[PDB]
Amino acid sequence: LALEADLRGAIGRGEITPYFQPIVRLSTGALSGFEALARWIHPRRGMLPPDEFLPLIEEMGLMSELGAHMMHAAAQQLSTWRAAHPAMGNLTVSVNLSTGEIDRPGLVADVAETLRVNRLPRGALKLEVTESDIMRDPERAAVILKTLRDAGAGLALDDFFSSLSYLTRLPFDTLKIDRYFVRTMGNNAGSAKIVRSVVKLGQDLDLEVVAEGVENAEMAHALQSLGCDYGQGFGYAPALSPQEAEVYLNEAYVDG
Ligand SMILES: [K+]
Ligand SMILES: [K+]
């Protein structure tokens, strides 16, 4: 079909769907939650990661349709896991709050409905927000992010002077360190300085910190020594299909 129709169909049929990457407490290895990550199970091209299809969605103005679909799928999966394990702690699932959603009237009601129909505890679903999303309109971000916390969503600042100022106002609970910095910190002093800076801020200002792109034990151990709370990456597990994530969860030690 035409591009917009093809993408609306792939989203609506769930061809574009979440895989789930474990987020672990670095000091113990215990599972804290998962990140919901979009994949296109493309019928002709095979599985495609976001970097190979998101530009199409952006061009067609479909970020809200993709984001909604991802948030619904992520929340439903968490709900299923909660029902299966009624004594389990507050296992989280993070998902990107897609660009433009902060501006969309009706985001808050959607989030609230999603939390409540899935019976999710406060903070079980965490929404990831970037600096560039905030920068579109910081005033609207301050209103809407506060209201999302009142609805029961958690909030992470992904890819964490502008950001220091935004942090003072906005009710984030989690900071994420970009994989580039983690992967280059061993060999690049400036990347190590940035990693250390984010970790130290979280410790000083009581925000949790997630390192992305943790590839191996050397990297994990370096982050453990700094006191970074959490990690995700190939050193622990890739993004997993729902079926694989279920197995991972059932075999896991859960944080807390
Ligand atoms: K935790
Ligand atoms: K992300």
Side-chain angles (χ1 to χ4, degrees):
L1 308 173
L3 178 58
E4 185 169 358
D6 277 340
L7 302 167
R8 289 185 183 278
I11 293 163
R13 297 190 301 273
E15 296 188 356
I16 301 171
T17 197
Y19 274 34
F20 294 90
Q21 182 170 44
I23 296 173
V24 305
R25 183 175 300 281
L26 288 169
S27 64
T28 60
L31 179 63
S32 192
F34 295 86
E35 190 184 9
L37 293 161
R39 298 291 181 262
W40 194 356
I41 308 301
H42 191 289
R44 296 170 328 274
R45 298 277 71 79
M47 191 158 111
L48 302 173
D51 294 344
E52 304 287 342
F53 74 82
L54 202 61
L56 296 166
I57 311 264
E58 291 195 18
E59 187 155 326
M60 293 300 93
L62 292 171
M63 294 297 284
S64 289
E65 287 82 352
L66 171 63
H69 175 80
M70 289 296 296
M71 215 212 62
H72 299 156
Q76 290 154 18
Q77 182 60 264
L78 185 49
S79 193
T80 296
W81 288 332
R82 284 173 63 62
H85 301 103
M88 182 179 67
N90 196 8
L91 183 81
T92 60
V93 174
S94 307
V95 66
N96 284 348
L97 182 61
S98 63
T99 302
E101 285 286 83
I102 287 168
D103 291 345
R104 179 176 65 91
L107 176 64
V108 165
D110 289 356
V111 174
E113 175 69 346
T114 297
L115 301 182
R116 298 282 91 73
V117 299
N118 287 295
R119 287 167 259 197
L120 296 179
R122 185 180 191 87
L125 191 74
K126 195 187 303 299
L127 301 171
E128 298 180 60
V129 179
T130 67
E131 177 182 302
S132 51
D133 295 341
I134 294 158
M135 193 170 292
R136 293 165 55 96
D137 183 347
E139 291 298 325
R140 175 92 183 169
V143 168
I144 293 300
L145 295 188
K146 179 220 98 173
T147 304
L148 294 169
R149 185 157 288 274
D150 297 338
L155 293 169
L157 186 48
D158 188 18
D159 190 18
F160 183 73
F161 73 85
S162 299
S163 35
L164 289 164
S165 84
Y166 296 158
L167 272 189
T168 67
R169 175 80 179 290
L170 297 178
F172 288 104
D173 58 67
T174 300
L175 309 174
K176 305 197 77 193
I177 302 171
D178 190 74
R179 61 197 184 267
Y180 176 83
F181 298 125
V182 176
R183 282 153 185 190
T184 57
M185 70 188 166
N187 196 39
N188 183 328
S191 293
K193 173 176 185 183
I194 290 165
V195 174
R196 287 204 311 278
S197 294
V198 181
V199 171
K200 174 183 198 288
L201 195 69
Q203 289 164 357
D204 285 342
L205 137 46
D206 297 300
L207 307 156
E208 292 181 303
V209 179
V210 179
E212 295 191 37
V214 184
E215 287 276 307
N216 59 40
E218 182 177 10
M219 294 184 203
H221 294 166
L223 296 157
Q224 281 177 337
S225 179
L226 295 177
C228 187
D229 306 277
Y230 304 109
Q232 56 183 123
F234 196 63
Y236 289 102
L240 299 174
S241 71
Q243 296 68 32
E244 293 165 332
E246 172 77 8
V247 168
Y248 187 94
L249 176 54
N250 288 343
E251 295 177 354
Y253 292 99
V254 175
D255 183 40

PDB file of all heavy atoms in Angstrom, residues 23-25 28-33 88 91 247-256:
ATOM      1  N   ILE A  23      16.995  -5.321  32.576  1.00  0.00           N
ATOM      2  CA  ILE A  23      17.721  -4.277  33.322  1.00  0.00           C
ATOM      3  C   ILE A  23      18.024  -4.891  34.669  1.00  0.00           C
ATOM      4  O   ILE A  23      17.102  -5.363  35.381  1.00  0.00           O
ATOM      5  CB  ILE A  23      16.905  -2.972  33.481  1.00  0.00           C
ATOM      6  CG1 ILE A  23      16.654  -2.340  32.099  1.00  0.00           C
ATOM      7  CG2 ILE A  23      17.634  -2.023  34.445  1.00  0.00           C
ATOM      8  CD1 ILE A  23      15.737  -1.179  32.107  1.00  0.00           C
ATOM      9  N   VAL A  24      19.304  -4.975  35.021  1.00  0.00           N
ATOM     10  CA  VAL A  24      19.767  -5.677  36.232  1.00  0.00           C
ATOM     11  C   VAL A  24      20.408  -4.718  37.213  1.00  0.00           C
ATOM     12  O   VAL A  24      20.982  -3.702  36.830  1.00  0.00           O
ATOM     13  CB  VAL A  24      20.715  -6.827  35.908  1.00  0.00           C
ATOM     14  CG1 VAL A  24      20.079  -7.812  34.925  1.00  0.00           C
ATOM     15  CG2 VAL A  24      22.042  -6.333  35.375  1.00  0.00           C
ATOM     16  N   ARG A  25      20.324  -5.042  38.500  1.00  0.00           N
ATOM     17  CA  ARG A  25      21.137  -4.369  39.524  1.00  0.00           C
ATOM     18  C   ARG A  25      22.564  -4.851  39.357  1.00  0.00           C
ATOM     19  O   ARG A  25      22.828  -6.032  39.404  1.00  0.00           O
ATOM     20  CB  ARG A  25      20.609  -4.625  40.917  1.00  0.00           C
ATOM     21  CG  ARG A  25      21.420  -3.847  41.951  1.00  0.00           C
ATOM     22  CD  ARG A  25      20.911  -3.938  43.341  1.00  0.00           C
ATOM     23  NE  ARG A  25      19.568  -3.425  43.414  1.00  0.00           N
ATOM     24  CZ  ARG A  25      19.220  -2.140  43.450  1.00  0.00           C
ATOM     25  NH1 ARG A  25      20.125  -1.170  43.447  1.00  0.00           N
ATOM     26  NH2 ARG A  25      17.936  -1.814  43.534  1.00  0.00           N
ATOM     27  N   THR A  28      24.434  -7.185  42.154  1.00  0.00           N
ATOM     28  CA  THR A  28      23.929  -8.510  42.449  1.00  0.00           C
ATOM     29  C   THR A  28      23.623  -9.306  41.183  1.00  0.00           C
ATOM     30  O   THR A  28      23.466 -10.528  41.243  1.00  0.00           O
ATOM     31  CB  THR A  28      22.647  -8.430  43.244  1.00  0.00           C
ATOM     32  OG1 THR A  28      21.650  -7.718  42.480  1.00  0.00           O
ATOM     33  CG2 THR A  28      22.829  -7.760  44.584  1.00  0.00           C
ATOM     34  N   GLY A  29      23.407  -8.647  40.053  1.00  0.00           N
ATOM     35  CA  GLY A  29      22.876  -9.339  38.921  1.00  0.00           C
ATOM     36  C   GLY A  29      21.385  -9.540  38.898  1.00  0.00           C
ATOM     37  O   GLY A  29      20.879 -10.110  37.909  1.00  0.00           O
ATOM     38  N   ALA A  30      20.675  -9.095  39.928  1.00  0.00           N
ATOM     39  CA  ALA A  30      19.214  -9.374  40.072  1.00  0.00           C
ATOM     40  C   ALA A  30      18.423  -8.580  39.062  1.00  0.00           C
ATOM     41  O   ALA A  30      18.787  -7.443  38.702  1.00  0.00           O
ATOM     42  CB  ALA A  30      18.743  -9.068  41.449  1.00  0.00           C
ATOM     43  N   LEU A  31      17.359  -9.170  38.549  1.00  0.00           N
ATOM     44  CA  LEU A  31      16.514  -8.549  37.571  1.00  0.00           C
ATOM     45  C   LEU A  31      15.659  -7.487  38.221  1.00  0.00           C
ATOM     46  O   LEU A  31      14.840  -7.790  39.101  1.00  0.00           O
ATOM     47  CB  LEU A  31      15.618  -9.630  36.921  1.00  0.00           C
ATOM     48  CG  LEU A  31      14.639  -9.140  35.882  1.00  0.00           C
ATOM     49  CD1 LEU A  31      15.306  -8.545  34.684  1.00  0.00           C
ATOM     50  CD2 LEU A  31      13.714 -10.312  35.442  1.00  0.00           C
ATOM     51  N   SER A  32      15.747  -6.258  37.739  1.00  0.00           N
ATOM     52  CA  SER A  32      14.914  -5.160  38.211  1.00  0.00           C
ATOM     53  C   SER A  32      13.690  -4.857  37.340  1.00  0.00           C
ATOM     54  O   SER A  32      12.675  -4.356  37.772  1.00  0.00           O
ATOM     55  CB  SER A  32      15.781  -3.917  38.308  1.00  0.00           C
ATOM     56  OG  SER A  32      15.093  -2.882  39.031  1.00  0.00           O
ATOM     57  N   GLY A  33      13.858  -5.105  36.049  1.00  0.00           N
ATOM     58  CA  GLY A  33      12.815  -4.815  35.070  1.00  0.00           C
ATOM     59  C   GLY A  33      13.299  -5.089  33.672  1.00  0.00           C
ATOM     60  O   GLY A  33      14.318  -5.694  33.490  1.00  0.00           O
ATOM     61  N   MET A  88       5.497 -11.343  43.663  1.00  0.00           N
ATOM     62  CA  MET A  88       6.650 -10.678  43.153  1.00  0.00           C
ATOM     63  C   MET A  88       6.586  -9.174  43.452  1.00  0.00           C
ATOM     64  O   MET A  88       5.510  -8.583  43.439  1.00  0.00           O
ATOM     65  CB  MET A  88       6.695 -10.919  41.649  1.00  0.00           C
ATOM     66  CG  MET A  88       7.875 -10.325  40.914  1.00  0.00           C
ATOM     67  SD  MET A  88       7.875 -10.699  38.989  1.00  0.00           S
ATOM     68  CE  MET A  88       6.321  -9.691  38.455  1.00  0.00           C
ATOM     69  N   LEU A  91       8.571  -5.239  39.707  1.00  0.00           N
ATOM     70  CA  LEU A  91       9.292  -5.385  38.462  1.00  0.00           C
ATOM     71  C   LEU A  91       8.829  -4.304  37.504  1.00  0.00           C
ATOM     72  O   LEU A  91       7.636  -4.131  37.343  1.00  0.00           O
ATOM     73  CB  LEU A  91       8.964  -6.762  37.886  1.00  0.00           C
ATOM     74  CG  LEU A  91       9.695  -7.164  36.584  1.00  0.00           C
ATOM     75  CD1 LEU A  91      11.085  -7.674  36.852  1.00  0.00           C
ATOM     76  CD2 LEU A  91       8.892  -8.203  35.831  1.00  0.00           C
ATOM     77  N   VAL A 247      10.935 -16.901  29.919  1.00  0.00           N
ATOM     78  CA  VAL A 247      11.874 -17.882  30.429  1.00  0.00           C
ATOM     79  C   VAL A 247      12.904 -17.193  31.308  1.00  0.00           C
ATOM     80  O   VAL A 247      13.203 -17.675  32.381  1.00  0.00           O
ATOM     81  CB  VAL A 247      12.585 -18.645  29.262  1.00  0.00           C
ATOM     82  CG1 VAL A 247      13.774 -19.459  29.753  1.00  0.00           C
ATOM     83  CG2 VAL A 247      11.596 -19.541  28.465  1.00  0.00           C
ATOM     84  N   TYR A 248      13.419 -16.044  30.859  1.00  0.00           N
ATOM     85  CA  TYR A 248      14.442 -15.299  31.597  1.00  0.00           C
ATOM     86  C   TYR A 248      13.865 -14.940  32.977  1.00  0.00           C
ATOM     87  O   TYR A 248      14.527 -15.147  34.013  1.00  0.00           O
ATOM     88  CB  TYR A 248      14.862 -14.030  30.825  1.00  0.00           C
ATOM     89  CG  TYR A 248      16.022 -13.315  31.445  1.00  0.00           C
ATOM     90  CD1 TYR A 248      17.337 -13.532  31.049  1.00  0.00           C
ATOM     91  CD2 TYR A 248      15.813 -12.456  32.520  1.00  0.00           C
ATOM     92  CE1 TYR A 248      18.388 -12.856  31.663  1.00  0.00           C
ATOM     93  CE2 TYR A 248      16.840 -11.804  33.172  1.00  0.00           C
ATOM     94  CZ  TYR A 248      18.136 -11.997  32.725  1.00  0.00           C
ATOM     95  OH  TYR A 248      19.201 -11.352  33.359  1.00  0.00           O
ATOM     96  N   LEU A 249      12.652 -14.404  33.020  1.00  0.00           N
ATOM     97  CA  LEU A 249      12.005 -14.010  34.285  1.00  0.00           C
ATOM     98  C   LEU A 249      11.845 -15.205  35.207  1.00  0.00           C
ATOM     99  O   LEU A 249      12.190 -15.124  36.381  1.00  0.00           O
ATOM    100  CB  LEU A 249      10.625 -13.405  34.028  1.00  0.00           C
ATOM    101  CG  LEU A 249       9.779 -13.024  35.237  1.00  0.00           C
ATOM    102  CD1 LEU A 249      10.526 -12.099  36.184  1.00  0.00           C
ATOM    103  CD2 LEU A 249       8.418 -12.412  34.820  1.00  0.00           C
ATOM    104  N   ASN A 250      11.378 -16.333  34.675  1.00  0.00           N
ATOM    105  CA  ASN A 250      11.110 -17.479  35.544  1.00  0.00           C
ATOM    106  C   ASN A 250      12.379 -18.063  36.159  1.00  0.00           C
ATOM    107  O   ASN A 250      12.326 -18.670  37.239  1.00  0.00           O
ATOM    108  CB  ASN A 250      10.300 -18.529  34.777  1.00  0.00           C
ATOM    109  CG  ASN A 250       8.847 -18.103  34.529  1.00  0.00           C
ATOM    110  OD1 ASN A 250       8.337 -17.196  35.167  1.00  0.00           O
ATOM    111  ND2 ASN A 250       8.184 -18.779  33.582  1.00  0.00           N
ATOM    112  N   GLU A 251      13.506 -17.879  35.482  1.00  0.00           N
ATOM    113  CA  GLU A 251      14.815 -18.328  35.968  1.00  0.00           C
ATOM    114  C   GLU A 251      15.591 -17.320  36.764  1.00  0.00           C
ATOM    115  O   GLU A 251      16.695 -17.579  37.245  1.00  0.00           O
ATOM    116  CB  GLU A 251      15.695 -18.790  34.790  1.00  0.00           C
ATOM    117  CG  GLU A 251      15.105 -20.012  34.119  1.00  0.00           C
ATOM    118  CD  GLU A 251      15.866 -20.508  32.886  1.00  0.00           C
ATOM    119  OE1 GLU A 251      16.834 -19.852  32.432  1.00  0.00           O
ATOM    120  OE2 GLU A 251      15.474 -21.583  32.371  1.00  0.00           O
ATOM    121  N   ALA A 252      15.042 -16.123  36.882  1.00  0.00           N
ATOM    122  CA  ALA A 252      15.753 -15.026  37.490  1.00  0.00           C
ATOM    123  C   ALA A 252      15.633 -14.950  38.992  1.00  0.00           C
ATOM    124  O   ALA A 252      14.748 -15.530  39.600  1.00  0.00           O
ATOM    125  CB  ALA A 252      15.277 -13.675  36.850  1.00  0.00           C
ATOM    126  N   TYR A 253      16.599 -14.275  39.591  1.00  0.00           N
ATOM    127  CA  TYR A 253      16.476 -13.702  40.918  1.00  0.00           C
ATOM    128  C   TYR A 253      15.981 -12.272  40.732  1.00  0.00           C
ATOM    129  O   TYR A 253      16.659 -11.497  40.035  1.00  0.00           O
ATOM    130  CB  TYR A 253      17.858 -13.624  41.596  1.00  0.00           C
ATOM    131  CG  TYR A 253      18.510 -14.928  41.971  1.00  0.00           C
ATOM    132  CD1 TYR A 253      19.485 -15.505  41.152  1.00  0.00           C
ATOM    133  CD2 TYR A 253      18.184 -15.575  43.171  1.00  0.00           C
ATOM    134  CE1 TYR A 253      20.110 -16.717  41.512  1.00  0.00           C
ATOM    135  CE2 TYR A 253      18.791 -16.782  43.537  1.00  0.00           C
ATOM    136  CZ  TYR A 253      19.754 -17.343  42.708  1.00  0.00           C
ATOM    137  OH  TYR A 253      20.358 -18.531  43.058  1.00  0.00           O
ATOM    138  N   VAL A 254      14.859 -11.891  41.325  1.00  0.00           N
ATOM    139  CA  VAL A 254      14.274 -10.571  41.157  1.00  0.00           C
ATOM    140  C   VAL A 254      14.820  -9.626  42.220  1.00  0.00           C
ATOM    141  O   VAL A 254      14.905  -9.967  43.397  1.00  0.00           O
ATOM    142  CB  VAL A 254      12.701 -10.606  41.195  1.00  0.00           C
ATOM    143  CG1 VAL A 254      12.092  -9.200  41.134  1.00  0.00           C
ATOM    144  CG2 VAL A 254      12.158 -11.530  40.095  1.00  0.00           C
ATOM    145  N   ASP A 255      15.203  -8.427  41.797  1.00  0.00           N
ATOM    146  CA  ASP A 255      15.775  -7.412  42.682  1.00  0.00           C
ATOM    147  C   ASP A 255      14.817  -7.114  43.814  1.00  0.00           C
ATOM    148  O   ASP A 255      13.642  -6.867  43.581  1.00  0.00           O
ATOM    149  CB  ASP A 255      16.056  -6.166  41.840  1.00  0.00           C
ATOM    150  CG  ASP A 255      16.718  -5.062  42.612  1.00  0.00           C
ATOM    151  OD1 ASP A 255      17.592  -5.385  43.432  1.00  0.00           O
ATOM    152  OD2 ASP A 255      16.408  -3.869  42.400  1.00  0.00           O
ATOM    153  N   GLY A 256      15.325  -7.149  45.039  1.00  0.00           N
ATOM    154  CA  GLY A 256      14.504  -6.859  46.209  1.00  0.00           C
ATOM    155  C   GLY A 256      13.924  -8.120  46.807  1.00  0.00           C
ATOM    156  O   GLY A 256      14.063  -9.246  46.277  1.00  0.00           O
TER     157      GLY A 256
END
